[PDB]
Structure 1
Amino acid sequence: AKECVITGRKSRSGNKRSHAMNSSKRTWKANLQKVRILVNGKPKKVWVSARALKSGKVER
């Protein structure tokens, strides 16, 4: 449930590399920030990413 409520981007998985290309396992998290926006007729605090928050959202 930790995901953006507008563009539902969230954690994904991938590899972590080094010299000699030893492969470990890691993850990529989204830049989720907790803000208070009008998600409905009333405001609420939800997870919103920093990229869906730079054009046209609400009070924040």
Structure 2
Amino acid sequence: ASTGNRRSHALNSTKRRWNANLQKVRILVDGKPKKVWVSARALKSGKVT
């Protein structure tokens, strides 16, 4: 998903995205240590490096 509005003071609307905070890091996927994008929230408590 992750679209929605930007709203003005007179309450106009323009469509707009919210992007995740992807950072490129080297994780240990199956086999090699590989570089990949993953969000900062996801490596808060999800996945080893």
TM over 0.5: yes
CA RMSD, 1 decimal: 1.5
When normalised by structure 2's length, the TM-score is 0.83
Instruction: Tell me: CA distance 1:16–1:53, structure 2 relative to 1, closer, same or farther (3 Å).
Output: same
Unmatched 5+ residue regions in structure 2? none
The aligned residue for residue 20 of structure 2 is 30
Runs of 4+ in 1 over 6 A off after TM superposition: none
Unmatched 5+ residue regions in structure 1? 1-10
Higher-strand-fraction structure: 2
The aligned residue for residue 3 of structure 2 is 13
Q: Distance in 1 between matches of 2:11 and 2:44?
A: 37
Larger Rg over CA atoms = 2
Q: Could you tell me the percent identity over the aligned residues?
A: 80
Tell me the matched-pair count: 49
1:55 Cα deviation after fit: 2.0
Of the three residues 25, 33, 36, the one matched with 1:43 is 33
